[PDB]
Ligand binder design. Sequence first.
Ligand SMILES: COC1=C(OC)C(=O)C(CC=C(C)C)=C(C)C1=O
Lengths: 218, 148, 216
Amino acid sequence: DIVMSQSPSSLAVSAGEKVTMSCKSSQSLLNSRTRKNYLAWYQQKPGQSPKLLIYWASTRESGVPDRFTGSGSGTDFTLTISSVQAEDLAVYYCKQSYNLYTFGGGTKLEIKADAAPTVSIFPPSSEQLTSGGASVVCFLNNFYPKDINVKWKIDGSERQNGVLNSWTDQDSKDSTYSMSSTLTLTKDEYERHNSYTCEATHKTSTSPIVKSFNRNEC
Amino acid sequence: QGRGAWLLMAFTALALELTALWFQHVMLLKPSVLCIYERVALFGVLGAALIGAIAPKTPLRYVAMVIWLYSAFRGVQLTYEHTMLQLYPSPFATCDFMVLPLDKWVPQVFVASGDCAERQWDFLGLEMPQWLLGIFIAYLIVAVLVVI
Amino acid sequence: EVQLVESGGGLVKPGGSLKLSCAASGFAFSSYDMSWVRQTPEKRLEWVAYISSGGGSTYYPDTVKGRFTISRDNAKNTLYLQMSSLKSEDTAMYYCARPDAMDYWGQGTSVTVSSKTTAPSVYPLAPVCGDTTGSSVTLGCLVKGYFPEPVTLTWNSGSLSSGVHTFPAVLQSDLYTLSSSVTVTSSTWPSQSITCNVAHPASSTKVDKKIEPRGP
Ligand SMILES: COC1=C(OC)C(=O)C(CC=C(C)C)=C(C)C1=O
């Protein structure tokens, strides 16, 4: 078929800049009759259906801000977004519709000042326990940049086997990561100690933000 | 409304379907696409006029109406998508040919070998199917809005 | 104004079968054409089927031609994709799209192809049992030991939507496990109720968990 191939995989930019990623197709996309370049650009927000952005190659679609622009012609298309708002976190896909429908691989436009991670620890839930297991989690909301070494503490003695995380893909309104580590024990091994906590180390200052609780009551 | 107000139009449809045929064989110009399907549309229009004419009379003139209505409206929708399919060609296409004998019971006007050159210098900023679309409105908008 | 909601598909075994319907609503249905796009686990985007306005012609990539069937019924306004001989390649999210250039896209039905469904366990996460009031109280919801992806976690029937994080399920063993934070003013919690709704489609599970404080 035709092969669409975009470069680069990813772009960073500080909120309000010009970005011009590129889409190149294996086959020319021009008709003899009418300069009609039969390529579309679709933007797709994190966990959303793609949205139509530009068709034909140049022409924008109902409620596309002038800032997204489509240049290109033949085998060589380029999408250009001036004044990058925060709600422009997306992968941008090009599609050919000259002979069947093919897509590019995608270009992730992730946004670029730091902020302090906001930890909060959460004990097992009664029922989880009375159903034969015990899991302890703490969320690290609204931090930036990505890098954060979160360390669990059992009163002070620090074990690791069974501590599985996950970073949200960068927020679109506030444009900053999050995270969530889960320490997952057996029902009975949980009351081995009393005090529990977790710490960040995130580089707003490497003064490891701590948030704690202690078993007994809960 | 006699043998004239039909035999004129019955002639007027030869004054196109042969006009078209000129291209096939002189200005070769082979192609068809839906154009053969469209040739048929005017050989429907004939019937109407030629029947509204030959044995006029006052009963059969009611028949001639509907058939002078059908193959014109049919004409349009055939010339329309045919036109559309340029101002808007569809990511798929096909480029096919093929099919009472449509193909058989005539060769020189019922054969369809449009092998797709994505180009036609159909005169005056309008393609044949683009003209023919109009002329077919000029038979539909008669029939109804200038007859019944 | 114009809507599409595809649905009806979770897990299916290799060689399997299963049919999805895009419930179309809010445009001159019988006049447009319809298409069926899936998105792979790599986040890749493959076009899958295309039916013409009047069900006349259909088209398919060679990769599903034969195994897949794009019907429509403008009586009940639905589009259909009928999947057969199911390859574990077919494993993807399934969008239903509209062309004139896909201008109104659905939302997806995830479809996975593999060989063991598992209803998700849903535990509510109440904060420290200490009365220690801060200011912006965050509560959680925890979802554990399920197959397959995805789930659908909603705070208060979609009404709590502003100020919530839902972290990418992970692949310990062959069960996925996923967490959910939601911040909110201390004024708006305990007094006012806040519950976690979880929907496992690939198993039919409408587990509701109301976030309770911590009595003894
Ligand atoms: C394939 O191209 C076409 C022609 O060339 C062979 C025609 O003659 C015609 C018919 C033209 C006249 C003047 C009746 C049409 C509609 C057409 O599409």
